[PDB]
Design a protein around this ligand. Structure first.
Ligand SMILES: [Zn+2]
Length: 136
């Protein structure tokens, strides 16, 4: 749970997937089907491949399986940070990992999903790690 910013480039390469390295570093992209080990059969807790934080949990998850699915409020917002970017006359809320710059995903508000947050998080697209809660 140490500061990931101090990590060297080599450590990052030998820490996570090649796609995760560029994607996490500068939000290079978020294209799935880049890893055969990626498994989402069990529905538990989402975990950043970079560190393994509980970014998202099934409690606010509304989907079975999809390349770019939508979610509701994360575990507690402690594992992820939401910030807006005034790129132009309009701004966008980028989703990042509280432990690393996981600016690979974005979240939209006012989607109308009849939820307390009414957010549409579009992440879990670059081979994110799934934690099997139980599903017994
Ligand atoms: Zn992370």
């Amino acid at each position: 749970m140490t500061n990931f910013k101090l990590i060297t480039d080599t450590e990052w390469r030998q820490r996570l997937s090649s796609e995760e390295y560029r994607v996490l570093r500068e939000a290079g992209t978020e294209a799935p089907h880049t890893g055969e080990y990626t498994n989402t059969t069990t529905e538990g807790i989402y975990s950043c491949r970079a560190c393994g934080t509980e970014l998202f949990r099934s409690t606010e998850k509304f989907n079975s399986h999809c390349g770019w699915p939508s979610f509701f409020s994360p575990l507690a917002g402690d594992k992820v940070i939401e910030r807006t970017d005034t790129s132009h006359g309009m701004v966008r809320t980028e989703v990042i990992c509280a432990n690393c710059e996981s600016h690979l995903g974005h979240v939209f508000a006012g989607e109308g999903y009849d939820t307390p947050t009414d957010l549409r998080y579009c992440i879990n697209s670059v081979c994110l790690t799934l934690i099997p809660a139980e599903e017994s």
